[PDB]
Amino acid sequence: QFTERALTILTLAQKLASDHQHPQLQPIHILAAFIETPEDGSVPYLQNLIEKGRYDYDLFKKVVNRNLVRIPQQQPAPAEITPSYALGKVLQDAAKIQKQQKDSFIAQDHILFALFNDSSIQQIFKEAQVDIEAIKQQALELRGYLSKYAIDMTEQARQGKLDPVIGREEEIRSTIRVLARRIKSNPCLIGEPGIGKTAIIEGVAQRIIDDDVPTILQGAKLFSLDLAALTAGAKYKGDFEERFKGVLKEIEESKTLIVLFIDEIHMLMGNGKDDAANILKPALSRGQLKVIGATTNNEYRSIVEKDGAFERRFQKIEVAEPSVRQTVAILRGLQPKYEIHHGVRILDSALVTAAQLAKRYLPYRRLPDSALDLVDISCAGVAVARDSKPEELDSKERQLQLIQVEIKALERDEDADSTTKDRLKLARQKEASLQEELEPLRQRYNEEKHGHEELTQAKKKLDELENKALDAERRYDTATAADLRYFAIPDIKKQIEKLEDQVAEEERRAGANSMIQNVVDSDTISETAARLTGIPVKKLSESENEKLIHMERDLSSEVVGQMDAIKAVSNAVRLSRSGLANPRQPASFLFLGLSGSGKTELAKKVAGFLFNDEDMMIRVDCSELSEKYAVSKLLGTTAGYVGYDEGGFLTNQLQYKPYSVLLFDEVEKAHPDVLTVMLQMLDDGRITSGQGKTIDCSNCIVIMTSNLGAEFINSQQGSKIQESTKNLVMGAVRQHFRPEFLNRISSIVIFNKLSRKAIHKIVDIRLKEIEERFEQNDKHYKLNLTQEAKDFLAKYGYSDDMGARPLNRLIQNEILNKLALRILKNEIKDKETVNVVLEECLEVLPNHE
Amino acid sequence: QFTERALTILTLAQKLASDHQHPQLQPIHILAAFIETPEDGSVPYLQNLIEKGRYDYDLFKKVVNRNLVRIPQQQPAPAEITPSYALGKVLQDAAKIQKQQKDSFIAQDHILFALFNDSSIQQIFKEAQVDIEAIKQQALELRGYLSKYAIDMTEQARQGKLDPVIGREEEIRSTIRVLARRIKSNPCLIGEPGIGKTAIIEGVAQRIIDDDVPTILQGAKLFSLDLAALTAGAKYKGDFEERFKGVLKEIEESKTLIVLFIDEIHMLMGNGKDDAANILKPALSRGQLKVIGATTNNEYRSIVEKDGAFERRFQKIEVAEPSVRQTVAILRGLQPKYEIHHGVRILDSALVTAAQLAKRYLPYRRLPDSALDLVDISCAGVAVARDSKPEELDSKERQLQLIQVEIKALERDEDADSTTKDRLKLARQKEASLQEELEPLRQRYNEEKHGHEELTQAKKKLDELENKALDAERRYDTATAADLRYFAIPDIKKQIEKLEDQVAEEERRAGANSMIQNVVDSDTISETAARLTGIPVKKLSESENEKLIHMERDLSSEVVGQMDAIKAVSNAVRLSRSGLANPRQPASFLFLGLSGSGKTELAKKVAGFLFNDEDMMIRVDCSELSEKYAVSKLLGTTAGYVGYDEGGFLTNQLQYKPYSVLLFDEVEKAHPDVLTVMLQMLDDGRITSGQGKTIDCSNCIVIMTSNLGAEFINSQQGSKIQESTKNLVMGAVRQHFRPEFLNRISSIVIFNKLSRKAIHKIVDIRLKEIEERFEQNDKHYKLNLTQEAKDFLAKYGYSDDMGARPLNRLIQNEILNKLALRILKNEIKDKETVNVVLEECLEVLPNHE
Ligand SMILES: Nc1ncnc2c1ncn2[C@@H]1O[C@H](COP(=O)(O)OP(=O)(O)OP(O)(O)=S)[C@@H](O)[C@H]1O
Ligand SMILES: Nc1ncnc2c1ncn2[C@@H]1O[C@H](COP(=O)(O)OP(=O)(O)OP(O)(O)=S)[C@@H](O)[C@H]1O
Ligand SMILES: Nc1ncnc2c1ncn2[C@@H]1O[C@H](COP(=O)(O)OP(=O)(O)OP(O)(O)=S)[C@@H](O)[C@H]1O
Ligand SMILES: Nc1ncnc2c1ncn2[C@@H]1O[C@H](COP(=O)(O)OP(=O)(O)OP(O)(O)=S)[C@@H](O)[C@H]1O
């Protein structure tokens, strides 16, 4: 079919044959059809591909008019009996040209290409155009180089390959509102990268296409001017200015109220620069050039700090992150796209779960991207598995080849006639069994694959019908809108439903099919999340009974005594993983006590327990504090400063390990310099670093620790600290920290004197671990602590003022020192005996062998 | 060889000879190369040497273009052939001109001088150009960097299309006066960005074209510079400095005198001097280089302190934000511009509102900037509102189209004849019904559109006639000015008035145009501000007293009891809001009652209402307080002493939240020296600090709290405290506090003891908040509190001394921690059962499922 421009030329050619009473419509008339006027700025006459291509128009009009005179007349009714072979071919070739250029309709431009292929003027010395070489270049020389350096967003949005962007309607309308401004008329989208800023623009393109804009903008058009525009479409010094003040100049006039945009967005800080004004200001001032800009939060600040003129030319727009609900709605709209992408079924609950998980395990990553990546990655994953089902197929194929080896090893011989090798027949029988089992597995699997291919295509076809329906609706093309809405779409819809039923669900499983090829809400998605990030905080691992429910016992086992603290912890972690801890606040505690009490041991054991890794913990030296409080703290240094470790000791670790237990050392030594930062983590954990990037602390439990309370706790008035003493501690804590800081801590916890009844068990744990960690048991002890070593250790070391620490020392002082001596003296070959003789008395083994 | 302009103009001559297929390239083609188009603005054609040299350029245009046509046409092989002697000589002579001018390349003007010497127009009335010495005088007017780095503000002003500058008349004159100086004549505008500092520059541009400028300056041009030659980008050392030198010296040649303007001195400074940026400016502080600089008050001081020279190169010209009334005057001057800029009408009260509101909500942004945007945005909003036309028409037309689709869909069938689908005729009735509604709606909208349209067009015509009159008047063209005043302008005014008759405000529609809602006072403006900043109570078109009163009623309802306290506060606040209280004094209160009484919450609610945010509350622990009162308060330590974070806790919040509430928690425990500071704090809001800067507390309510008389309140003498009880808490206040304090406090506010009869409401409110705040779910309780929880929570929880603090803790432990555990046990699918067992617990709703 033809465009309005092309159809006009066709129509005019026919008109001219009738007007001149000619029996045949010839290229001469179509050439005449182009030269409607003698206008210098008209593409049909002097901005024409022919003029710029090869033959001059003063000469052209002479050629055309000479032929119009030479072509014979009729008595009007017989005009145009034929179009000649020539226009038949040219007009159809113009369709061929569409196909070469991948255009939807025949352009007048295409008719000119068709004419170049067939342009020949009868004469002894015939006139002609170059077959096509010049015109391909001349097409670029029409306003169209815009398409060389830019994507016509409205053309593409109208054509297809554009997602149903939703949840951005507020922002789309706001962007349009800015375009409706008179001074700051160039909206700018600001936020996280990857947030749908382009999607907003695309949404605007759709509204322009639909004419759902405030009248003035109905005459508008959107283009993405980039990449090629920036650099790739050129190679010489000065080419920038030439393509810039070329494509922009073309854009600036006549061809609709063109609005441009950048996809590399921050790029204006390099694509503007010397031309920061020239890129727009005078193009807007002289007419209608408008743009939709964009930048990240950090880049926004940079373009402002660098220039700032952009705040006179542009209007800053914040772009939101969607809620899980909104994210899911987005995923649902695109769910069939994803199913088509991989030929995989996707559960609705997988979109919900992926969105919930993405926020829970990667809170600092864009939610809709992360949710999607989790899905597209897992979709891709199962699609890969389904290529071979190797567990059955590779296993049998290997067994078959192993048989082939046995076959040649036994067959290609003289001993082949002896039972020595003729035993081979047994392997051949096995070969046959494997071939017979394998082929139906193979074909069954191919059938399962085909079912997915059928679904893929059925869904694809439906969407194409929809794309077409949407264009028909905006054209108010009732006829094709009806062709699609009635019967065609319902047909494919029903085919899809039938194809889904072809899965042949049976009571034994969701399909007669042996393979899954689906995205299961938790199994597929939770697994993928774990494979991608290690720790799946919302996995809800089966063993909850120990993992949080009986955490008190696990903590009691690792941390003996301090039952009050353990119970305080147990309540805390249950709130953090049950989801009850309100999302507005990471759980946080202050651990107060005496040295050797185990207060940091408990926190480490919490990390141990929750992540199965005590090294999951991130430590903060809150006592090493001065005005430098940057790279070593939760803020980092700031972009523009020398060095790239912008929180290189913490902020990067917090994102690296998205959640953990963050623990601060002796916070009593801390100052507001960082306490007012820790505060930003204590609740509403969104600390923005000097990178412009945010920690977004959520799941992470934050522990503050201190011996501040020792001032009263060390009264030792019972191992269990009593009210009074605790209030004095509380008082002192409030003296040290802003009480409001403290009020954002979930609870302040006071540790007890580590009781001797606890220590009496702790030392066994320690001694066991001490020995086990000493490389290999090529030495070590038999470790018969008996009643006596345990009691010596107690009587000579369970100090009320050092807890477990003096025991570490005692053990070394006695137990390991004597061992070392027995080792050095070659009294031990392996292991060693343990006892006390009155006075620790490590015994000695028979001399080393 | 040739330079870019020269090689191009030669290339064009050569191109024309080959394009028109001429046998020879000659003076006609080079003249044609210069006369590219009829545009006089083409540098090659009329503002060129061609018009300025005398020759009747119309003759060159006609003769040359006619000759391109008359010169014989040839085949491509004979096309062009040679430049001949004729142009050989011209180009060779152009080289001789290079020698004359010291030009490294041949210039287009050299070509013209040479061309002019040899070529003439052979006509019966033959002409030739004035000799080249006269022509060179004209050549020297063109160029000899600003075109790539600056905007010619005076020429812009001369052409109109420049906003009138309002409220800066003296600042404009001040810079002119300074520019008149023989040395160090560069003024620098000092003030915050967005204050209209460039408005002054625009104003100067207007003074130049108005001829109000001293002759010595009058003959000068005015440019807006910086950034393009400072911050835009560099690859090497000196890239900006090269551009500086370029401009710094180009300015000394040909172009009389040029006044430049620098957007920001802070970007210049000198990078540790380092022979960079700013250091190049003092170099020409006597060397003409007239320039108006600009920076901020804050940076200015540090620029000068670090530089030492700047203050002797540039003059310190201060610029400040306009008052709200001045802002409105600016807006009024722009009001009709906004109307034509947007195609809307604007109420004057909207300008008033915009200026008032814009100031009130922007502690971090300039009034004239934001007032101008508030108006440009809000009126853009109204312009966007024209969407009403397609909104109403499309909602209906869309349904119409859906109906039409059904119609074509069902007509093309066999069931179409069956009533099965022939009931379709009803769809046709609906199509028609909608068409009948759509046509008068559409025509209504067309009329509405045209009404405003024509009004706008007439206003635009008026403004351009006015621009012509203003130019005619200032340039003393009394003929033009008189004609414009001689009814041209009065008549367009009459047309505008007749168009107002066509607006035809109807009694039912106060402007016959629903598309143009108009910028309606504060409805449009508050809406706009709210859309841009958040939605406060402040959005309402209410007096300060009414906003307060409506909120006081909510306050009385939300707080349990304490109505007497609320009224005491309300009275004082109203006195203050009215301006009757002396403005120097912030309101302040002493909240006297029981600990746990809600006194803090009253104050928070006051913040929640008067400042629309409970979380803006600033708090002081007065019990943890001794003789050293510093950082934790307002004073900070004295700078010169460690404790640079002056008034780290309170001053910082007050200075960043000037409109808030500050509490003194248990103020009766404050150290006596602090209490004397308090006297300072209770009036004369210019409260001191360590840096010497005062607080200027006005809009911050300061509430001191006290439990001094708590024991009398405990007497339970009425649910609202009665005489002989409240008199004793005041007695205690008189005993403790000096009369001096009591004589400054707006009111001593007395709180009552209140039983569970209404405290239970608090308990319920908190329970509602607690379940509702769970952002990710709604597993709502079967909240079977029954009487047992009402009292348990009010018996083992809510305390006469600690209020709700223990409720919160009971709920966390007996409800949320119990809930967390059973969630992790997977015993909850949805909802949960309350089961108070006498203490408290939850029953598991599923059967431990
Ligand atoms: N509201 C939405 N509805 C549908 N798809 C969306 C939506 N928001 C984002 N997406 C998709 O999420 C991705 C992020 O979109 P983009 O607009 O490219 O991000 P961006 O903000 O443009 O960042 P850059 O700098 O252009 S990568 C895209 O692949 C979009 O298709
Ligand atoms: N209740 C306990 N159960 C098991 N081990 C314990 C216990 N208490 C202390 N320890 C041991 O004591 C050490 C940690 O003691 P803590 O008191 O947490 O550390 P600390 O004394 O605070 O050291 P700081 O605070 O960084 S100086 C570990 O090596 C533990 O094995
Ligand atoms: N008195 C006035 N008369 C006319 N226009 C004004 C007036 N005051 C302010 N403006 C306009 O309001 C804005 C404030 O101007 P400036 O203070 O120069 O902004 P700025 O400091 O230049 O900010 P940048 O750097 O250009 S984003 C300008 O865009 C002026 O056009
Ligand atoms: N009459 C009341 N109106 C509203 N809330 C009240 C009332 N009485 C008690 N409360 C609640 O109980 C608490 C009392 O708070 P406050 O009086 O600030 O306690 P406080 O005296 O500040 O000392 P703490 O340590 O914060 S309890 C608040 O959280 C209130 O919600």
DSSP-assigned states of every residue in A732-754: HHHHHS-HHHHTTSSEEEEPPPP
Contacts of B182 (CB under 8 A, 6+ apart): none
* Phi, psi torsion values for A303, nearest 5 degrees: -70, -30
Residues B519/B350, Cβ–Cβ less than 8 Å: yes
Distances (CA, A) of B392 to A15, B381, B441: 42, 18, 8
Same domain, B290 and B331: no
Q: With CB atoms and an 8 Å threshold, state whether A482 touches B408.
A: yes
For β-strands B842-843 and B832-834, DSSP reports them as antiparallel
Same domain, A718 and A602: yes
Q: Is B196 in the pocket of ligand 3 (CB under 6 A)?
A: yes
Whole-angstrom distance, CA of residue A432 vs CA of residue A404: 11
Look at residues B350, B397, B398, B407 and name the one whose alpha carbon lies nearest to residue B374. B350
Same domain, A552 and A640: yes
Same domain, A698 and A579: yes
Q: Is B261 in the pocket of ligand 3 (CB under 6 A)?
A: no
**Measured between beta carbons, which residues in chain A are less than 8 angstroms from residue B773?**
582, 584
Residues B132/B242, Cβ–Cβ less than 8 Å: no
A41 touches chain B (CB under 8 A): no
Nearest to A473 among B376, B401, B816 (CB): B401
And the tokens for A567? 């119970």
Q: With CB atoms and an 8 Å threshold, state whether A181 touches B21.
A: no
B68 Cα distance to chain centroid: 56
Residue A240 CA, ligand 1 centroid: distance in Å: 29
Residues 259-318 of A with CB under 8 A from B: 270, 272-274, 276-277, 306-309
Q: Can you tell me which atom of ligand 4 is nearest the CA of B803?
A: 12
Nearest CA residue ID for atom 5, ligand 1: A165
Q: With CB atoms and an 8 Å threshold, state whether A549 touches B824.
A: yes
Same domain, B415 and B524: yes
Look at residues A280, A270, A224 and name the one whose alpha carbon lies nearest to residue A248. A280
And the tokens for B524? 């449009």
Counting Cα atoms < 13 Å in the Cβ hemisphere of A29 gives 30
Distances (CA, A) of A194 to A190, A304, A320, B589: 11, 21, 11, 51
For β-strands A127-128 and A120-121, DSSP reports them as antiparallel
Nearest to A583 among B228, B775, B820 (CB): B775
Residue A319 CA, ligand 1 centroid: distance in Å: 11
Q: Is A448 in the pocket of ligand 2 (CB under 6 A)?
A: no
DSSP label at residue A812? I
Q: Is B294 in the pocket of ligand 3 (CB under 6 A)?
A: no
**In the block, residue with structure tokens 């050092």:** A802
DSSP string, B256-309: S-EEEEES-GGGTS-TTSTT-GGGGSGGGSSSS--EEEEE-HHHHHHHHHHHSS
Q: Strands of B291-295's sheet, edge to edge?
A: B151-152, B221-225, B258-262, B291-295, B186-190, B314-318
Instruction: Give, rounded to a whole angstrom, the gap between the first and last alpha carbons of chain A.
Output: 99
Residues 702-741 of A with CB under 8 A from B: 731, 734-735, 738-740
Whole-angstrom distance, CA of residue A425 vs CA of residue A244: 78
Nearest to B773 among A577, A582, A738 (CB): A582
Among A321, A348, A377, where does a domain finish?
A321
Whole-angstrom distance, CA of residue B121 vs CA of residue B93: 20
DSSP string, B399-461: HHHHHHHHHHHHHSSSTTTSHHHHTTHHHHHHHHHHHHHHHHHHHHHHHHHHHHHHHHHHHHH
The helix (H) or strand (E) run that includes residue B758 is helix B756-772
Helix axes A551-558, A563-578, angle to 10 degrees: 140
CA angle B192, B197, B200 (to 5 degrees): 160
* Phi, psi torsion values for A649, nearest 5 degrees: -95, -15
For an interface test with A, give the residue of B405, B619, B821, B848 to mutate (most A CBs within 10 A): B405
And the tokens for A238? 């000065």
Residues A603/A661, Cβ–Cβ less than 8 Å: yes
**Measured between beta carbons, which residues in chain A are less than 8 angstroms from residue B527?**
none
Distances (CA, A) of B339 to A679, B9, B447, B452: 49, 46, 19, 10
Q: Is A596 in the pocket of ligand 2 (CB under 6 A)?
A: yes
DSSP label at residue B812? I
Q: Which ligand is nearest to the CA of A370?
A: 1
Among B298, B321, B344, where does a domain finish?
B321
Look at residues A749, A748, A754, A757 and name the one whose alpha carbon lies nearest to residue A716. A754
Helix axes B348-360, B367-384, angle to 10 degrees: 130
Does some domain include residue B198?
Answer: yes
Q: Coil, helix or strand for B520?
A: coil
Neighbour tally for A450: CB within 10 Å: 12
Q: Where are the beta strands (DSSP E) in B47-179?
A: 151-152
Whole-angstrom distance, CA of residue A298 vs CA of residue A640: 11
Domain that holds residue A728: 541-753
The domain spanning residue A235 has which CATH number? 3.40.50.300
Does some domain include residue B121?
Answer: no
**In the block, residue with structure tokens 């649910």:** B719
> DSSP H helical segments within B611-689, as ranges?
650-656, 672-681
Q: With CB atoms and an 8 Å threshold, state whether B645 touches A672.
A: yes
Look at residues B409, B399, B463 and name the one whose alpha carbon lies nearest to residue B437. B399
Q: With CB atoms and an 8 Å threshold, state whether B774 touches A582.
A: yes
β-partners of residue B259 are: B222
And the tokens for A586? 């990471």
CA distance B392 to chain A (A): 12
**Measured between beta carbons, which residues in chain B are less than 8 angstroms from residue A575?**
816-817, 820
Same domain, A745 and A765: no
Q: Can you tell me which atom of ligand 3 is nearest the CA of B167?
A: 1
Residue A394 CA, ligand 4 centroid: distance in Å: 72
Same domain, A305 and A200: yes
B193 touches chain A (CB under 8 A): yes
Residues 463-522 of B with CB under 8 A from A: none
Whole-angstrom distance, CA of residue B356 vs CA of residue A19: 70
Residue A805 CA, ligand 2 centroid: distance in Å: 7
The helix (H) or strand (E) run that includes residue A472 is helix A425-475
Same domain, B696 and B716: yes
Residue B801 CA, ligand 4 centroid: distance in Å: 9
Amino acid at A179: L
Dihedral angle over CA of B716, B721, B725, B728, nearest 10: 130
Same domain, B767 and B749: no
Whole-angstrom distance, CA of residue B16 vs CA of residue B26: 10
Among A267, A292, A321, where does a domain finish?
A321
Dihedral angle over CA of A754, A758, A759, A765, nearest 10: -130
Q: With CB atoms and an 8 Å threshold, state whether B376 touches A184.
A: yes
Whole-angstrom distance, CA of residue B619 vs CA of residue B649: 8
A672 touches chain B (CB under 8 A): yes
Whole-angstrom distance, CA of residue A818 vs CA of residue A842: 6
Q: Which residues of B341-379 are buried (b: 16+ CB within 10 A; e: fewer)?
A: bbbbbbbeebbbbbbbbbbebbeeebbbbbbbbbbbbbb
Does some domain include residue B15?
Answer: no
Amino acid at A435: Q
* Phi, psi torsion values for A291, nearest 5 degrees: -135, 160
DSSP string, A486-546: IIIHHHHHHHHHHHHHTT--BTTBSSS-S---EE-TTHHHHHHHHHHHS--TT---S-TII
What is the total count of domains within chain A? 4
Contacts of A482 (CB under 8 A, 6+ apart): B405, B406, B407, B408, B409, B412
Whole-angstrom distance, CA of residue B726 vs CA of residue B590: 13
Amino acid at A56: D
Q: What is the resolution of this structure in A?
A: 6.7
Does some domain include residue B117?
Answer: no
Same domain, B504 and B575: no
Does some domain include residue A127?
Answer: no
Residues A616/A661, Cβ–Cβ less than 8 Å: yes
Residues A438/A397, Cβ–Cβ less than 8 Å: yes
And the tokens for A520? 């299961």
Q: Can you tell me which atom of ligand 3 is nearest the CA of B372?
A: 12
Residues B130/B55, Cβ–Cβ less than 8 Å: yes
For β-strands B660-665 and B781-782, DSSP reports them as unpaired
Q: Is A160 annotated as a binding residue?
A: no
Nearest CA residue ID for atom 16, ligand 1: A196
Based on the number of CB atoms within 10 Å of its own CB, is B739 exposed (0-12), middle (13-18) or buried (19 or more)? exposed
Q: Coil, helix or strand for A684?
A: coil
Q: Coil, helix or strand for B38?
A: coil
DSSP string, A5-55: HHHHHHHHHHHHHHHTT-SB--HHHHHHHH-SS--TT-TTTTSSHHHHHSS
Nearest chain B residue to A179 by CA distance is B380
Q: With CB atoms and an 8 Å threshold, state whether A212 touches B390.
A: yes
Residue A165 CA, ligand 1 centroid: distance in Å: 9
Neighbour tally for B440: CB within 10 Å: 9
The helix (H) or strand (E) run that includes residue B726 is helix B726-736
Q: Coil, helix or strand for A706?
A: strand
A56 touches chain B (CB under 8 A): yes
The domain spanning residue A835 has which CATH number? 1.10.8.60
Q: Is B330 in the pocket of ligand 3 (CB under 6 A)?
A: yes
Does some domain include residue A111?
Answer: no
Look at residues A696, A663, A362, A681 and name the one whose alpha carbon lies nearest to residue A534. A362
Does some domain include residue A359?
Answer: yes
Residues B59/B127, Cβ–Cβ less than 8 Å: yes
Whole-angstrom distance, CA of residue B537 vs CA of residue B541: 10
**In the block, residue with structure tokens 């009587």:** A795
Whole-angstrom distance, CA of residue B220 vs CA of residue B209: 10
The alpha carbons of chain B give a radius of gyration, in whole angstroms, of 40
Does some domain include residue B671?
Answer: yes
> DSSP H helical segments within A286-366, as ranges?
297-306, 310-313, 324-342, 348-361
Q: With CB atoms and an 8 Å threshold, state whether A734 touches B389.
A: no
Residues A794/A787, Cβ–Cβ less than 8 Å: no
Q: With CB atoms and an 8 Å threshold, state whether A578 touches B813.
A: no
Same domain, B733 and B784: no
Same domain, A560 and A525: no
Whole-angstrom distance, CA of residue A50 vs CA of residue A63: 13
Look at residues A172, A176, A181, A222 and name the one whose alpha carbon lies nearest to residue A200. A172
